[PDB]
Amino acid sequence: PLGSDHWGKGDMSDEDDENEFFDAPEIITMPENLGHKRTGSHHH
Amino acid sequence: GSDHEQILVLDPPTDLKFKGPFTDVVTTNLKLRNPSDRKVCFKVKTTAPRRYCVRPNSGIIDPGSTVTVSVMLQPFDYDPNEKSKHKFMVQTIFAPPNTSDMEAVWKEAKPDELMDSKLRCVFEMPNE
């Protein structure tokens, strides 16, 4: 539903913090992170 | 005591309240007012960007004027034994009277001129 033409700035940060504050996006589109897991696991 | 307030008034000032069953998104609006005779840039920060959404994310407030910021808190598995770990933070700094770029105000802003304040997330059940 919601969104903008340019958003989601700020990256590569790493510091000591009581809770870790983030730059609070307008809406969530990509939860957690991407990874190598595909069509089940192993069977290589 | 070493805690102090920013130029912007907040509403609620103390904590963000989330009332509703957490089976769906909760919407909580925060009112920010400017007491000053100057323009001011505002920014919002949160403890989890994949569990909390802030429609504007940022902006500027005029002298004597107010902006309403909608927070959308995402559904989760609540536990009555678990404690709230989540917080909000609002950062503010004075804007010049003749700019078209809000990001440049944050790049000219200094760590000694930057104001902020912090708030917790509260969770309440409908009980009906």
Q: Residue with structure tokens 């790493």?
A: A14
Distance from CA of B51 to the nearest CA of A (A): 8
Domain boundaries, chain B: 1-128
Angle at B92 between CA B87 and CA B94, to 5 degrees: 180
**C-beta separation of B34 from B62 below 8 A:** yes
B50 token code pair: 């994949």
Q: In chain A, which residues have their Cβ closer than 8 Å to the Cβ of B44?
A: 24
End-to-end CA, chain A: 39
Q: Which architecture does CATH list for B1-128?
A: Sandwich (2.60)
- DSSP-assigned letter for residue B19: E
Cross-chain residue pair A21–B85, CB shorter than 8 Å: no
Q: Which amino acid does the sequence have at B110?
A: K
Domain count, chain A: 1
Secondary structure percentages of chain B, helix, strand, coil, to 5? 5, 45, 50
Residue linked to tokens 């509703």: B20
Pick from A13, A18, A26 the residue to mutate for testing the B interface (most B CBs within 10 Å).
Answer: A26
Domain range holding A36? 1-44
Please state how this structure was obtained.
NMR
